[PDB]
Design a protein around this ligand. Structure first.
Ligand SMILES: O=C(N[C@@H](Cc1ccccc1)P(=O)(O)C[C@H](Cc1cc(-c2ccccc2)no1)C(=O)N[C@@H](Cc1ccc(O)cc1)C(=O)O)OCc1ccccc1
Ligand SMILES: *[C@@H]1O[C@H](CO[C@@H]2O[C@@H](C)[C@@H](O)[C@@H](O)[C@@H]2O)[C@@H](O[C@@H]2O[C@H](CO)[C@@H](O[C@@H]3O[C@H](CO)[C@@H](O)[C@H](O)[C@@H]3O)[C@H](O)[C@H]2NC(C)=O)[C@H](O)[C@H]1NC(C)=O
Ligand SMILES: *[C@@H]1O[C@H](CO)[C@@H](O[C@@H]2O[C@H](CO)[C@@H](O)[C@H](O)[C@H]2NC(C)=O)[C@H](O)[C@H]1NC(C)=O
Ligand SMILES: *[C@@H]1O[C@H](CO[C@@H]2O[C@@H](C)[C@@H](O)[C@@H](O)[C@@H]2O)[C@@H](O)[C@H](O)[C@H]1NC(C)=O
Ligand SMILES: [Cl-]
Ligand SMILES: [Zn+2]
Length: 607
């Protein structure tokens, strides 16, 4: 590690602790910058040489983390817990936390290579027919979204899970052992405990569970209604009205979002067609337009536009030249207060439009807190970061806002239209809740040793059935590693943030709508052009992680805790409607025939 990047001396009291933190953050900017740059170079251009460079960049970060970490522990370890300044307690608490830098050299390199190999496998995995091969993004995504052929959907589902999952398992086991080894030397019982500590709530898991209890009836009812619709199209052989839904029929590879089957479930088809995708295509929208339209919403709020460095540096389309990339969307902070980028293999679609806003939400956060000390450049909690863009997308997707941007010709205000809109939103937002909740439950069990390699898939599918009410359409066994077929698992990034942001985003929406002086039903609010809503959001963004999230929430929303009530109020009309539909249809809520799996199609597997 470069002499300039190494730590000096500071006194072993609270006041020396203050000066230590000041120089730490000064050197960290350059280390973070070269780390992110090396990751950028790789994720936008997956080569062995670029993986190597990224790995050597991670080693440097680990040396850095070691030097300042050992120093922070040398001076402050026994005393920093009783320190009077709680913000200093945070930063020093984070510097005494070495992570992977706790590993000896050989194991650091082992760790770094594993992250690189898992990433490459997920992002370059393909499903071959017999010479031509389909990628996840766009090919398999498109199939799952628009094919209504059972065997074609199954081919894509099975192919993807087999191709991504199977080779990942050995590497995932080794990663887990080394991640746990690293973080246990930091005093955590396992890596899952570390991840959970970011929410600093001794009661985190109980709070989440109480939240899910309130939300579960909404899911059960959406599930039953949707399953009925699928039965009408796939028949009695492939759909069990008292069983779980096959996992490949819900419009999405992970059955995590159901918006793509909206056309099958829409209650009042005579009302404006709220799936704007075809209108976008008919009008000739491109990635560029999508990002510009999203930017303009942000500026209508008197938030920052994207800087020139964003437009010149970002990757907004999947490259056409022989180049493999990580296609999964991400927002990037280079930690030089100048470069900020999005990397997204953008598709011309309504859900991709929401994704664009979601990604730009991350960037906007980066722009607003760029002048904070480096350690305070995070969300109030990770869920805050995830909720920013979705909140704007809640406004954008209202029929009225879509009309304003030329994506919907007619404007209607009636109970039929509302039911249509709220159902579409439920398929996006309510359908996700079980999945957003279950992913880290699985992964927390893995980290704790409750779920050993011998039960990876067994436990995955237990949770998938328990929460989502779905079943794999083909038989799985422990050779399969179906969790590794989801991006966030091999890319070693946490998931509970998304369950938190799905609750949080309706809390934010309510507050910004009230702040904008909007008096109507919550699901018809559009905060577009509300500078008052903008100023209120800006305060949250400019705060970064400088204050406990409970206080930031309180200032914004009026409550210091997560709360499902604004989500419930938002969906009240369709919740009551779906209940009534199901009772009139004499549906069974849930999947009592838990053991049920669909048969194979007659000509499986040949297409
Ligand atoms: O860029 C990311 N994170 C990206 C993932 C990533 C993490 C680490 C390394 C590399 C990449 P994403 O979550 O923007 C990338 C995207 C977001 C998304 C999807 C969608 C969407 C909407 C409708 C239909 C389908 C998808 N909308 O937004 C993501 O991973 N989403 C999750 C969960 C999700 C789903 C729906 C949704 O509305 C929001 C979130 C998923 O795809 O499974 O991190 C920024 C950041 C910085 C500091 C602190 C916290 C977060
Ligand atoms: C779509 O329509 C709804 C419903 O509109 C109401 O009911 C209809 C059947 C008709 O009788 C309408 O004339 C009637 O307004 C609209 O929701 C309503 O918005 C109005 C105006 O913003 C609200 O009135 C306000 O109510 C507050 C108290 O909460 C007062 O302080 C204000 O002075 C003002 O009177 C009304 O509460 C609200 N009604 C309901 C049931 O939610 C909605 O605005 C409209 N949406 C769009 C996009 O046009
Ligand atoms: C993708 O990464 C590779 C490195 O793996 C880049 O190839 C280098 O490009 C420079 C300048 O063109 C050459 O001087 C080097 O000799 C190349 N290195 C190797 C190992 O071939 C390549 O430029 C990147 N592609 C894109 C589009 O950015
Ligand atoms: C796990 O399963 C592997 C493949 O699955 C099997 O073949 C497919 C095409 C389906 O027909 C399915 O019913 C079968 O389970 C097997 O090749 C492998 O041997 C199994 N692993 C173990 C340890 O038994
Ligand atoms: Cl998280
Ligand atoms: Zn995100």
């Amino acid at each position: 590690l470069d002499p300039g990047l190494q730590p000096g001396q500071f006194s072993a009291d609270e006041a020396g602790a203050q000066l230590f933190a000041q120089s730490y953050q000064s050197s960290a900017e350059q280390v973070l910058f070269q780390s992110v740059a090396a990751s950028w170079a790789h994720d936008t251009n997956i080569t062995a040489e670029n993986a190597r460079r990224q790995e050597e960049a991670a080693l440097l970060s680990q040396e850095f983390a070691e030097a300042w970490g050992q120093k922070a522990k040398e001076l402050y370890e026994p005393i920093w817990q009783q320190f009077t300044d709680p913000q200093l307690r945070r930063i020093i608490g984070a510097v005494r936390t070495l992570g992977s830098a706790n590993l000896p050299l050989a194991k650091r390199q082992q760790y770094n290579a594993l992250l690189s190999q898992m990433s490459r496998i997920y992002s370059t995995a393909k499903v071959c027919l017999t010479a031509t091969c389909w990628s996840l993004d766009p090919d398999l995504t498109n199939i799952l979204a628009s094919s209504r052929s059972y065997a074609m959907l199954l081919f894509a589902w099975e192919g993807w899970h087999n191709a991504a999952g199977i080779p990942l398992k050995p590497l995932y086991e080794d990663f887990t052992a080394l991640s746990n080894e690293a973080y246990k030397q930091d005093g955590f019982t396992d890596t899952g405990a570390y991840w959970r500590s970011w929410y600093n709530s001794p009661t985190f898991e109980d709070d989440l569970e109480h939240l899910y209890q309130q939300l579960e009836p909404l899911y059960l009812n959406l599930h039953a209604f949707v399953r009925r619709a699928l039965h009408r199209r796939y028949g009695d052989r492939y759909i069990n009205l008292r069983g779980p839904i096959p996992a490949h029929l819900l419009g999405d590879m992970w059955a995590q979002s159901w918006e793509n089957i909206y056309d099958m479930v829409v209650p009042f088809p005579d009302k404006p067609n709220l799936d704007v995708t075809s209108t976008m295509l008919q009008q000739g929208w491109q990635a560029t337009h999508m990002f510009r339209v999203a930017e303009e919403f942000f500026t209508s709020l008197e938030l920052s536009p994207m800087p020139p460095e964003f437009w010149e540096g970002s990757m907004l389309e999947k490259p056409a030249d022989g180049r493999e990339v990580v296609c999964h969307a991400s927002a990037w902070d280079f930690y030089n207060r100048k470069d900020f980028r999005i990397k997204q293999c953008t598709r011309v679609t309504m859900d991709q439009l929401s994704t664009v806003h979601h990604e730009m939400g991350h960037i906007q956060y980066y722009l607003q807190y760029k002048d904070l000390p480096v350690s305070l450049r995070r969300g109030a909690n990770p869920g805050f970061h995830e909720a920013i863009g979705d909140v704007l997308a809640l406004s954008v997707s209202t029929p009225e806002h879509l009309h304003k941007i030329g994506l919907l010709d007619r404007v209607t205000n009636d109970t039929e239209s509302d039911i249509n809109y709220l159902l579409k939103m439920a398929l996006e937002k309510i359908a996700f809740l079980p999945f957003g909740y279950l992913v880290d439950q699985w992964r927390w069990g893995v980290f704790s040793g409750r779920t050993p390699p011998s039960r990876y898939n067994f436990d995955w599918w237990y949770l998938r059935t328990k929460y989502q009410g779905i079943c794999p359409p083909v038989t799985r066994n422990e050779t399969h590693f179906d969790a590794g077929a989801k991006f966030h698992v091999p890319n070693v990034t946490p998931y509970i943030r998304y369950f938190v942001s799905f609750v949080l985003q309706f809390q934010f929406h309510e507050a910004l709508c009230k702040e904008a002086g909007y008096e109507g039903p919550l699901h018809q609010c559009d905060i577009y052009r509300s500078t008052k809503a903008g100023a209120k959001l800006r305060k949250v963004l400019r705060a970064g992680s400088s204050r406990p999230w409970q206080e930031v929430l309180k200032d914004m929303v009026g409550l210091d805790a997560l709360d499902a009530q604004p989500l419930l109020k938002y969906f009240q009309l369709v919740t009551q409607w779906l209940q009534e539909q199901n009772q009139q249809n004499g549906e069974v809520l849930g999947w009592p025939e838990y053991q049920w799996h669909p048969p194979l199609p007659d000509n499986y597997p040949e297409g």
